[PDB]
Amino acid sequence: SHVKDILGLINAFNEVKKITVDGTTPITVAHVAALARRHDVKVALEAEQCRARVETCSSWVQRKAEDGADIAGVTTGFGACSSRRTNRLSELQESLIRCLLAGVFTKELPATATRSAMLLRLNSFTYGCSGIRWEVMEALEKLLNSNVSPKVPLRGSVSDLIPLAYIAGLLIGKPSVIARIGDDVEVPAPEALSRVGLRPFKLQAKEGLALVNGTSFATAVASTVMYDANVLLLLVETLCGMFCEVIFGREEFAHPLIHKVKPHPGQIESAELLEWLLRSSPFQELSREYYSIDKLKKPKQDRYALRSSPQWLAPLVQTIRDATTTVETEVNSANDNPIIDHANDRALHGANFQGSAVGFYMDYVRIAVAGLGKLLFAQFTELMIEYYSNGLPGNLSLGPDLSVDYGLKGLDIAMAAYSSELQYLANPVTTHVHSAEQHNQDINSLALISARKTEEALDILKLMIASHLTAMCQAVDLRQLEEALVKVVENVVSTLADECGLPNDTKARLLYVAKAVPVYTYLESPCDPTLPLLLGLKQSCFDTILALHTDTLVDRLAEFEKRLSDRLENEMTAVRVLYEKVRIQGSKFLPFYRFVREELDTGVMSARREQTPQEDVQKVFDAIADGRITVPLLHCLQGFL
Amino acid sequence: SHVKDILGLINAFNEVKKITVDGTTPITVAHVAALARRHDVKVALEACRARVETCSSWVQRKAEDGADIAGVTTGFGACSSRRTNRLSELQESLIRCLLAGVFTDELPATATRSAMLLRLNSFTYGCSGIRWEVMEALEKLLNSNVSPKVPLRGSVSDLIPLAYIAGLLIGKPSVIARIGDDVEVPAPEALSRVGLRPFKLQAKEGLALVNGTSFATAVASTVMYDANVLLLLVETLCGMFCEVIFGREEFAHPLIHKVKPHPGQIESAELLEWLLRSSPFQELSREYYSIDKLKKPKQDRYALRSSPQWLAPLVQTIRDATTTVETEVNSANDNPIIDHANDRALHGANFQGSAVGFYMDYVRIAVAGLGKLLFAQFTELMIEYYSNGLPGNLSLGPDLSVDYGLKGLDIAMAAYSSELQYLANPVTTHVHSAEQHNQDINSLALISARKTEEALDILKLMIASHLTAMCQAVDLRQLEEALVKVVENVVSTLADECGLPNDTKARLLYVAKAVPVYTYLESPCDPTLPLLLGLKQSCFDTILALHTDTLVDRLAEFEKRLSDRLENEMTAVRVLYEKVRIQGSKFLPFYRFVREELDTGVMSARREQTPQEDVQKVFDAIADGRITVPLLHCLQGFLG
Amino acid sequence: RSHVKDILGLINAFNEVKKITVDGTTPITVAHVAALARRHDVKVALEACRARVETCSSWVQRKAEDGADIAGVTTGFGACSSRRTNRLSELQESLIRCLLAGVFTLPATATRSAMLLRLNSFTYGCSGIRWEVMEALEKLLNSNVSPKVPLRGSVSDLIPLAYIAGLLIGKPSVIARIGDDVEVPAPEALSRVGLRPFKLQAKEGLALVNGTSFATAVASTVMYDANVLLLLVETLCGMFCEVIFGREEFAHPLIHKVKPHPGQIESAELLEWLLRSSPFQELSREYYSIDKLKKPKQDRYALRSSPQWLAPLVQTIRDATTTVETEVNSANDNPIIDHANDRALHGANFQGSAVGFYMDYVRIAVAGLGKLLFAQFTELMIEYYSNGLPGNLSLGPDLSVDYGLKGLDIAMAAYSSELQYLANPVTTHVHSAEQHNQDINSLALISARKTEEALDILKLMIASHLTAMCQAVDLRQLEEALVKVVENVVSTLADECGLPNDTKARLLYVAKAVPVYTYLESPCDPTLPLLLGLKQSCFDTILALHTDTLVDRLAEFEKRLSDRLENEMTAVRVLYEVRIQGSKFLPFYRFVREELDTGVMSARREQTPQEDVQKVFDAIADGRITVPLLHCLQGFL
Numbered sequence A: 001s002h003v004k005d006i007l008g009l010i011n012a013f014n015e016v017k018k019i020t021v022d023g024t025t026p027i028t029v030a031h032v033a034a035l036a037r038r039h040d041v042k043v044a045l046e047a048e049q050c051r052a053r054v055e056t057c058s059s060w061v062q063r064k065a066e067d068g069a070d071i072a073g074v075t076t077g078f079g080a081c082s083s084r085r086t087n088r089l090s091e092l093q094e095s096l097i098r099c100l101l102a103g104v105f106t107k108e109l110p111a112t113a114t115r116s117a118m119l120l121r122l123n124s125f126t127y128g129c130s131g132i133r134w135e136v137m138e139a140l141e142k143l144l145n146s147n148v149s150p151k152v153p154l155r156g157s158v159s160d161l162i163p164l165a166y167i168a169g170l171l172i173g174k175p176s177v178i179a180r181i182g183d184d185v186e187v188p189a190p191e192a193l194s195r196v197g198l199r200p201f202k203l204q205a206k207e208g209l210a211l212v213n214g215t216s217f218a219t220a221v222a223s224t225v226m227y228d229a230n231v232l233l234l235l236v237e238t239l240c241g242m243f244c245e246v247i248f249g250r251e252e253f254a255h256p257l258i259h260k261v262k263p264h265p266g267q268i269e270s271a272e273l274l275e276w277l278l279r280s281s282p283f284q285e286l287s288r289e290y291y292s293i294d295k296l297k298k299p300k301q302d303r304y305a306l307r308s309s310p311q312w313l314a315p316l317v318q319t320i321r322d323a324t325t326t327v328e329t330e331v332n333s334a335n336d337n338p339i340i341d342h343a344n345d346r347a348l349h350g351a352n353f354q355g356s357a358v359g360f361y362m363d364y365v366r367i368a369v370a371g372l373g374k375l376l377f378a379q380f381t382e383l384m385i386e387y388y389s390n391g392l393p394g395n396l397s398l399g400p401d402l403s404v405d406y407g408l409k410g411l412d413i414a415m416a417a418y419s420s421e422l423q424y425l426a427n428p429v430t431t432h433v434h435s436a437e438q439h440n441q442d443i444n445s446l447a448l449i450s451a452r453k454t455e456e457a458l459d460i461l462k463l464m465i466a467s468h469l470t471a472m473c474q475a476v477d478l479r480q481l482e483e484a485l486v487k488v489v490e491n492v493v494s495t496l497a498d499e500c501g502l503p504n505d506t507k508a509r510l511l512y513v514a515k516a517v518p519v520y521t522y523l524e525s526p527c528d529p530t531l532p533l534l535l536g537l538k539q540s541c542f543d544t545i546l547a548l549h550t551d552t553l554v555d556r557l558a559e560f561e562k563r564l565s566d567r568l569e570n571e572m573t574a575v576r577v578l579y580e581k582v583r584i585q586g587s588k589f590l591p592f593y594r595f596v597r598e599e600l601d602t603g604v605m606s607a608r609r610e611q612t613p614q615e616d617v618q619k620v621f622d623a624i625a626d627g628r629i630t631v632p633l634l635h636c637l638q639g640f641l
Numbered sequence B: 001s002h003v004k005d006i007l008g009l010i011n012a013f014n015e016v017k018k019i020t021v022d023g024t025t026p027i028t029v030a031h032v033a034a035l036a037r038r039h040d041v042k043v044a045l046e047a048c049r050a051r052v053e054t055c056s057s058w059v060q061r062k063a064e065d066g067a068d069i070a071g072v073t074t075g076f077g078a079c080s081s082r083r084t085n086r087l088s089e090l091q092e093s094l095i096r097c098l099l100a101g102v103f104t105d106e107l108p109a110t111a112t113r114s115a116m117l118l119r120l121n122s123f124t125y126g127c128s129g130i131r132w133e134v135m136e137a138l139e140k141l142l143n144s145n146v147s148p149k150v151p152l153r154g155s156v157s158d159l160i161p162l163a164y165i166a167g168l169l170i171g172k173p174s175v176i177a178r179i180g181d182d183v184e185v186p187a188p189e190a191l192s193r194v195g196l197r198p199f200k201l202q203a204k205e206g207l208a209l210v211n212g213t214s215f216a217t218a219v220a221s222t223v224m225y226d227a228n229v230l231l232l233l234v235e236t237l238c239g240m241f242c243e244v245i246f247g248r249e250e251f252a253h254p255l256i257h258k259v260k261p262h263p264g265q266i267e268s269a270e271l272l273e274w275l276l277r278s279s280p281f282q283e284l285s286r287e288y289y290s291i292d293k294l295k296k297p298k299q300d301r302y303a304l305r306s307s308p309q310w311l312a313p314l315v316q317t318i319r320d321a322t323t324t325v326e327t328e329v330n331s332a333n334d335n336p337i338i339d340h341a342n343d344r345a346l347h348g349a350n351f352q353g354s355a356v357g358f359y360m361d362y363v364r365i366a367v368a369g370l371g372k373l374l375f376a377q378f379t380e381l382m383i384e385y386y387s388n389g390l391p392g393n394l395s396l397g398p399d400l401s402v403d404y405g406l407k408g409l410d411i412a413m414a415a416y417s418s419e420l421q422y423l424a425n426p427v428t429t430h431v432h433s434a435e436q437h438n439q440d441i442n443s444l445a446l447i448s449a450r451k452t453e454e455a456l457d458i459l460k461l462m463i464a465s466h467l468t469a470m471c472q473a474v475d476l477r478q479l480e481e482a483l484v485k486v487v488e489n490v491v492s493t494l495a496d497e498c499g500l501p502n503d504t505k506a507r508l509l510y511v512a513k514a515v516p517v518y519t520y521l522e523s524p525c526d527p528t529l530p531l532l533l534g535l536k537q538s539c540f541d542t543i544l545a546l547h548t549d550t551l552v553d554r555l556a557e558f559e560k561r562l563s564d565r566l567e568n569e570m571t572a573v574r575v576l577y578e579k580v581r582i583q584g585s586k587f588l589p590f591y592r593f594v595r596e597e598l599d600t601g602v603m604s605a606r607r608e609q610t611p612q613e614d615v616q617k618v619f620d621a622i623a624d625g626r627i628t629v630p631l632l633h634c635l636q637g638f639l640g
Numbered sequence C: 001r002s003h004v005k006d007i008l009g010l011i012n013a014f015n016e017v018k019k020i021t022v023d024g025t026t027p028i029t030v031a032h033v034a035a036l037a038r039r040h041d042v043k044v045a046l047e048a049c050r051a052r053v054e055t056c057s058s059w060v061q062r063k064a065e066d067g068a069d070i071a072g073v074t075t076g077f078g079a080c081s082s083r084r085t086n087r088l089s090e091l092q093e094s095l096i097r098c099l100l101a102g103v104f105t106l107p108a109t110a111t112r113s114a115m116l117l118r119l120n121s122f123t124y125g126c127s128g129i130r131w132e133v134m135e136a137l138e139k140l141l142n143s144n145v146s147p148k149v150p151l152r153g154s155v156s157d158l159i160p161l162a163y164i165a166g167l168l169i170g171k172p173s174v175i176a177r178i179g180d181d182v183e184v185p186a187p188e189a190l191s192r193v194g195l196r197p198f199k200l201q202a203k204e205g206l207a208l209v210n211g212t213s214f215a216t217a218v219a220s221t222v223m224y225d226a227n228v229l230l231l232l233v234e235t236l237c238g239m240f241c242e243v244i245f246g247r248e249e250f251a252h253p254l255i256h257k258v259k260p261h262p263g264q265i266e267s268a269e270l271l272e273w274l275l276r277s278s279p280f281q282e283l284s285r286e287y288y289s290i291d292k293l294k295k296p297k298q299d300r301y302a303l304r305s306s307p308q309w310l311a312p313l314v315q316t317i318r319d320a321t322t323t324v325e326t327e328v329n330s331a332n333d334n335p336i337i338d339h340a341n342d343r344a345l346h347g348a349n350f351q352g353s354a355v356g357f358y359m360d361y362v363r364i365a366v367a368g369l370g371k372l373l374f375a376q377f378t379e380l381m382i383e384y385y386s387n388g389l390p391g392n393l394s395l396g397p398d399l400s401v402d403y404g405l406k407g408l409d410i411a412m413a414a415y416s417s418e419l420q421y422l423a424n425p426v427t428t429h430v431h432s433a434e435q436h437n438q439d440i441n442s443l444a445l446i447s448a449r450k451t452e453e454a455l456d457i458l459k460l461m462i463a464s465h466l467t468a469m470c471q472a473v474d475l476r477q478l479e480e481a482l483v484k485v486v487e488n489v490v491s492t493l494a495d496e497c498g499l500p501n502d503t504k505a506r507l508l509y510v511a512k513a514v515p516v517y518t519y520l521e522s523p524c525d526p527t528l529p530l531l532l533g534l535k536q537s538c539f540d541t542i543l544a545l546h547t548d549t550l551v552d553r554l555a556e557f558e559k560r561l562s563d564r565l566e567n568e569m570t571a572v573r574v575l576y577e578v579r580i581q582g583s584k585f586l587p588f589y590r591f592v593r594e595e596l597d598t599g600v601m602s603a604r605r606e607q608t609p610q611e612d613v614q615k616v617f618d619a620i621a622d623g624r625i626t627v628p629l630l631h632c633l634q635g636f637l
């Protein structure tokens, strides 16, 4: 299952301490993300594996260039200018870098992406096709492990000459290039090199081109994008189960036979996960009891945001998993040109610098992320509306006084804003190819641009997941309070039926109403005669007077109402206050509920809780952003397959 | 390799004679396209029958005994809380409600018949509750070329359009039915003409007919068949582009792609290396770059050199999408799912067409990517600065003042590419909360499939144009080789006649070989054009090297003789050509097909046929499938 | 009379305003909003409209206390309006609590602009807010205090406005900036400016949040910038003509009179004036008089079709400015209190759709301006389309180690590509929102934000294009000087070698007619176009005069070309390292070269393309670019 594969990525992300870079061992997206996000993670460039290969290629290129071999961008001009020959080998390479230091700082790429790119460029060199000197690769390793990286302008690549030239610029000690050292220091490139015991390199044949002629920045951003897309995908799938529990869904939507006869792999696998999460759920028992009361006046099936979730998820799962493979292939490639086949004495002229595999798949993933967002939006919408939430209060407002408690209405508005922007972001970037660079680059991938937009889409999806999880924790509390309140109402009604000495017929009629009327429809003023509890009791009292048909019966029914009116509300208040100062204990989603309530320190939302919705959702968002959310996710899933 | 898979699709499309429908044998997109486009292809529903019967009997029996089953003893969609024992009238009321489209324009019969096949196929899995007799009727209608006229729009994926198939089966008079290409009659008359009687819907049968993905998936099936064929055509014609543009075939060298191993990158390059190995045009290319080598580009522009990298995601998208669409074709897309073996009806959402919808979005982006590749290649071909000796606009002339060549096609190619990029925005991002907020997610698959279909129509136009231009370029390259040999022989011959020294003779022949003929073809002895400029430059040099009055006498005589004979010899060879490298090329079948089989010729002011007339013939051959004959011929022997 | 004068008016107002008067009758323009955002010496002056404000606030408080039925005042909010209540203050406090729902994953300029716009809306006396709250807004604005606001959450501006309300009522969770440096909790911020936290009275929470202030604040600075940058682009089409050797006839008034889109007429009118008696158009005419019948009769579309292209873009930007200013000067609040007639009027003036749709349109028009710059830049970089200029505007002479502006050229494609992507619409993505109460909503802040991003990219493109054109000016001036040297050397060598007068004249024609940048790299190279032309002229002379003395002298001429030619060409170039002096674009060239301290780009100039373009970009961003723009346009109309 893809579920196992994603769990695999998460564990690798958590567990890795050293990234082996040797030209044969694969780098995964989890490794790239770990490097970027955990500074304890170090790069290990292995000499025994690949130094010999690199040195053979290096000396082949320098020897061949000095003897006047005709090789593009080595004894030849760049791009549209490859007709121009020259024997000024070093100055050809110097002139390239000067030409490409052409980005502009408005008011930049983050260090996470820049360090990831440096890693990917280093990896590309290990295949021994580039002609770069081993010593430069050692410098890249040292800069990575010492937290040194250049400040890079955001824009300029059609996919990654301009942004990579800033890495080259650091390596050759260009004084105009500014480098970070950790989080606090920044200094000119030459001073950065001296602080980590390096000297500026003088570029030899092909070395300038080797540094800049790759897909490292697009593929770097795409790598962290795809790691995040996997984690958030699994989180969304998992939380569809929690949604079923709180909304009072019918778990039959996940039955394996439904998906066996429409066997999209992502449909089968998401449904398999959901069935396991919901099997013998204590919340699904509450749902079953709810639909057994007044059965023929309630919906036979759930709305699509739940019932249709495996079908919806199918292409989204498949897109994210297929895109991960493609991105990792790019990570583990010689993306450079010319390709030096030193063994056969040939410089091979192609276009491995073309970022098209990444570019197209970034467009697809962004569409899939918008699909995940729409699912979340539709589920959240149902949850806020009492007509669609099967007993829950509008806006998940606890009240009891709803006139000063609008619950999660602000989050609901925000969810619409999030979905809307996300759907806009999902238009493609690859459809905007311009004929570029003196019409030499008449097709180009725009991969870094697309990756950056998919990254922005995932930021928004994070926000949407944080809100949805926060709302579902609120709904857990309201369902647990609901169960407790109905028991109080039944007890008061039963006891008072005895105290006032009503017949059995009457008593049982009244107890059915107490059981059947949704408690959140009258919690605000339980004895208000226009609200649904009294409305139901009154009609039951009229029927019982008709069925028994007297003055004594009426005396006692009148006494029942008075006694209700001095006792009911206080006992309902008491149980709610106790709750504020249990089905979730048997739910697979207990680790999420515990995480949010205890570890992040929150509570049921109400006018008596002074923390804003922002304060609560911020805590959840931060835990999603920094990876802490994977702990309850893995806890929730333990034992699965 | 995907190449062998696509060849397999094409062969299946051509060779199938009956589609076996039995609930276990897979239907492929080639089968669906065959059924749609070749009316001799018949459906054979193979009795599966026992399962279907057991299912219908269970449903009818349970409904009658008051079982609670959505859309069967329950209202539809957002109204599923309302129950009823009026089993037949519940089903008739659904069809009436869904006969809600408007004619503005309709879904074509090809799509409607494909949808009828896909609905029939869904029923074979024994999950739907429909009667076997209704399935037999669908088979008969399919084999008799009867289909309802269906409105284009109204599905968010396919209740409304499917209701017209149901309407035909129950003989609704307001439902108009096609029989073949012209006859249109009311549903009851159509049923009578093919020996059928209207059905009276029993429990669940209305819902069974309408509650699936057959229309979106039908359009998606022919969309994917075409995307596979057009993909292979584009990849193959990248090799023909290399031949006419004087490319360097090294871009397809396997080591380059081994070290960046995207499967579609490796597989496209593998095909291209094989296509270009031993090419006679690549011989001409190598000879071309050996002359003034240091004044000519070292490598090609991206539209060629980067083609395998560009093609890689396009290949992978089209192949993966094909698998997903076929999974849907071979599914029970219906609800509830009757699990009669376990005495249960299961409530889910297999009618949700999201797998198809999302993949139609991706394929449309990939198709836009193919169109951009074609546009870029075509652009280079039309511009003399980028075409390595070909005339601008591929204009033969010789009088270019009244011959603008393929400039009209060039303008059109920009219009095609531009529309195509617009079409490739996603449909799935426009999900509205629909049907009293019951359908708060919905796939829009039929809408998306329709837009991808529109994109592929434009792609066909671009392919037709590009192939037409490359046949022109083949002719221009063959005439170029013959014209230079004539120029060489005349210069060699006149050098002898005029008693020029060997230093002189060597210089003048170098010029004759080195100067691109299309730069002076319009007036070969014009002293301001490149041949004479070159000869005059070499004559000054020879006078200085040999330093006289006798040499000058002879050089003046050379210029005079050239001025009396050169034009006439160049004219005669061209006139003769208008009334050989390609014979050794793997693309010979394309050139032969376009030139001989479609009856075309080198384009010029002396050829009466318009660009329209020529490209129309190629487009028609792409659209009706005849183009696969030269394609399969071209690829014969690839990978054994 | 012209949109050009209207834009010059905006710029002057932006520069010159000292105080923004807020009074319920004097309009606020987009230049006023931008000036308050960007010039901290600009103060707000709330003019005590006091009477009508007080009348309105007392009407609302009294009516609410007496149990009048008013939405969001004695009833719940949005989808909850069925619920009535007499808990007047708590209702308003419950609203703010509910709306502090953003998350940190908006700049102070936008927040302060939004504060200005909310204050303005209140001056019309329709809102019920207390005068004292308005006084507080004025004080916060003038003291540079504003809340830190989350970027997202509005469908247009409840959530971001709630952070302004949270500041006013001293919510501890709300963080406030005071100037550029310090951040403190709201209560601390209020006390530092001598304010106390407000306790919201009837309608005040709603009044504070139920508006279009944020969408409209971002849109105001967007429209200010769009006007300035449009004029800059139009103006610089004239500079493009000068450097590319265009034919100025494309801007002739009759062409545009017979297709009279106002934007077409007015942009052509500017360009005609800019190009009249241009010293570069004089050079252009001389160029096309040499081998006239071998050169294009017309220019390519990026220049010749510029007025037709600009027409819709001018019109969209000017029309959108009007709409945005109408919104700035509106009571965007609900209910609207008609105190004179004792009615609270229930409508939807909080709906930002006028702004939202126009932000979509302007984003499309900005993408159009970008495409025009990209096309022009592309022409300039390609020797086949630049009428004599070197590829990539590379000075060389050694082109093998000078790729010129190739980096900037790649970046322009990247800029254009992203810009075209951004210009898809936001307003087509309306979701049914807020328990299906907001089943239509404008998304105006989101759209304004995307148009703002598009304008950031357009600034980069303009900075690049101006830098390239300054390079081109230098290359054109050097070109004229170099051709003079070649002519003089050829001329004197012809006399000195005793060549016939007709031979001399043919050789001098070659020197005038061959583009110098095709042989600057090695002028005596016998395969480059100078020597190719001279060789064919020398053979033609030999035939014409058909001797061993003539040939001796022609051979000496060729040889002695190596004595002096290259050294003289090198000398004039190094010395270079008057035509612009008489151009209307002199102020741009002088600004870029002298004021910003740059020079002709080459391998000998140590500064990178980044360093040069950064200077130009900064001047565009901070507004310094308007000084040379206004200088250039002095006297127009």
Ligand SMILES: O=C(O)/C=C/c1ccccc1
Pocket (backbone or CB within 6 Å): A072, A073, A078, A079, A080, A161, A213, A337, A338, A437
């Ligand atoms: O084709 C290549 O290998 C390199 C192209 C290029 C173009 C511009 C700058 C640098 C390299």
Ligand SMILES: O=C(O)/C=C/c1ccccc1
Pocket (backbone or CB within 6 Å): A301, B070, B071, B076, B077, B078, B159, B211, B335, B336, B435
């Ligand atoms: O869920 C189903 O099985 C059917 C839903 C539906 C909705 C509208 C019309 C008909 C059927």
Ligand SMILES: O=C(O)/C=C/c1ccccc1
Pocket (backbone or CB within 6 Å): C072, C077, C078, C079, C158, C210, C334, C434, C437
């Ligand atoms: O005027 C309306 O209909 C709604 C206003 C509003 C204010 C806050 C939250 C939601 C709605």
